[PDB]
Homo-oligomer: A and B are copies of this chain.
Amino acid sequence: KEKFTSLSPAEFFKRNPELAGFPNPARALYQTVRELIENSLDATDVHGILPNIKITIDLIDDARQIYKVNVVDNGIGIPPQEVPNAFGRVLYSSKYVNRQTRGMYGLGVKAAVLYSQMHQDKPIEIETSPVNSKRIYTFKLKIDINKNEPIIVERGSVENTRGFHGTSVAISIPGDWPKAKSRIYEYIKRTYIITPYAEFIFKDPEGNVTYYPRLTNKIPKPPQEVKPHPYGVDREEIKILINNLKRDYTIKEFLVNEFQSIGDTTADKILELAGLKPNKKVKNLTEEEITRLVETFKKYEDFRSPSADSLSVIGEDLIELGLKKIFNPDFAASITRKPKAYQGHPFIVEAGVAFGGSIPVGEEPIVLRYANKIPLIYDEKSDVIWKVVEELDWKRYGIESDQYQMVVMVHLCSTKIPYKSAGKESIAEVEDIEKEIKNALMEVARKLKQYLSEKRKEQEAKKKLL
């Protein structure tokens, strides 16, 4: 009959690699490159280190189309005791905390590792030296899919004669370079443009080398772990916060200590609206009381905004500088909005617009999407960003014709980006986010409208002379 079984997280993604962005050899190569670059960047600028990143892709077997991808960085490294699980245990991560990072699932690199053993037989190769480490630790690893645990094939150590800090990861996978080429280059090119404090070197499978020089030695303030904002915190999150407590807080104490934007005044008001007794021990909250808290958090209209300390923005100057460098337009403008909250997570939307000049002519805007400083490249038409741009009436902001030369850019940064898939190429339809993307686009479009009404006014004056 029907037979019931369970799977481990490794077997789940091994069975369904298209869920992590490994559906074909071209996209696999792209995904492997991007997960590694993202890890190296989280290991550097999140810790105040100006990134030096080296990427190499070598064709190691033309017949079988197997490529070896190697990414070397000057990050903080990884404690040797954590290396096995970091790369060989699905759903293991140092990024499950409330803080803006590129990684978030504790899936990324293991997905590439899984794809690697599914199609070839060489283990993945890791070399790492933590900050102030006397040694360089080496590993060769595979994943035991059934147990979802690391298999240490080889493990070793060498004397770190040069202070060296950082990580090298090398993984062999099926690939399709000709099909993946243009998007891999566009990925690196787009991250560089918004990361001018980093330096990249890229050697491709044909042996081309490209150099992306550091343009500034000023590093953005690192994002930090924060407490949740109360707006949108759910029932399960409340139970987690309660379970994590090491003191016998009252409900009032709980509210003031465990969240952002709650002082003694807001707290009293929340307790009253939620029908809760200030002095009750929070550990004794009932299932129904938890519900009332959550709904109260949800409908409360007077919360202060979260702070921006958990976030790292591109910023208006850089957005504008980048759009000008790439597109050489007649006009550019941008906006970094104030922080909002969704589902307890702080978030900011940034928007830019560029018009005219070297921008090609078309029937629709070129749309550049970024999430947590990652350039999104695939699945553009399923993105909530695309949904919002398409629904906006550009005619109301001066866009005359069917055909025009416009570029629209949107950056969402958050302690949590809600992607449509673990492949992280498109952003899901979360209403609070959709609304604030719309609001941001309206603010920049208003600036465009300003540029265009001046142009029309100039034209209208010159018309009289004809």
Contacts of A423 in B (CB 8 A): 420
Q: In this assembly, does A133 line the interface, its C-beta being within 8 Å of a C-beta of chain B?
A: no
| Distance (whole angstroms) from the CB of A41 to the closest CB of chain B | 14
Contacts of A460 in B (CB 8 A): none
Contacts of A4 in B (CB 8 A): 82, 85-86, 92-94
Q: In this assembly, does A145 line the interface, its C-beta being within 8 Å of a C-beta of chain B?
A: yes
The contact of A121 among B64, B93, B291, by CB within 8 Å, is B291
Whether the pair B430, A24 counts as a contact (CB closer than 8 A) is yes
Counting chain A residues whose Cβ lies within 8 A of the other chain, the interface size class is 35 or more
Contacts of A89 in B (CB 8 A): 6
Q: In this assembly, does A106 line the interface, its C-beta being within 8 Å of a C-beta of chain B?
A: yes
Contacts A2-B76, A4-B86, A419-B18; A235 near B23 (Cβ below 8 A): no
Contacts of A381 in B (CB 8 A): 381-382
Whether the pair B92, A6 counts as a contact (CB closer than 8 A) is yes
Chain A, range 44-89, C-beta contacts under 8 Å to B: 64, 76, 78, 82, 85-86, 89
Whether the pair A418, B16 counts as a contact (CB closer than 8 A) is yes
Whether the pair B106, A27 counts as a contact (CB closer than 8 A) is no
Chain A, range 203-256, C-beta contacts under 8 Å to B: 234-237
CA distance A80 to B14 in the complex (A): 30
CA distance A382 to B106 in the complex (A): 25
CA distance A64 to B235 in the complex (A): 14
| Distance (whole angstroms) from the CB of A406 to the closest CB of chain B | 20
0/1 per residue, A159-198, Cβ < 8 Å to B?
A: 0000000000000000000000000000000000000000
Contacts A118-B234, A423-B420; A430 near B382 (Cβ below 8 A): no
Whether the pair B94, A3 counts as a contact (CB closer than 8 A) is yes
Contacts of A420 in B (CB 8 A): 18-19, 23, 379, 382, 420-421, 423
Chain A, range 1-21, C-beta contacts under 8 Å to B: 1-9, 12, 14-16, 18-19
Interface residues of A (CB under 8 A from B): 1-9, 12, 14-16, 18-19, 23-24, 27, 64, 76, 78, 82, 85-86, 89, 91-94, 96-97, 105-106, 114, 117-121, 145, 234-237, 287-288, 290-291, 294-295, 379, 381-382, 416, 418-423, 426, 428-431
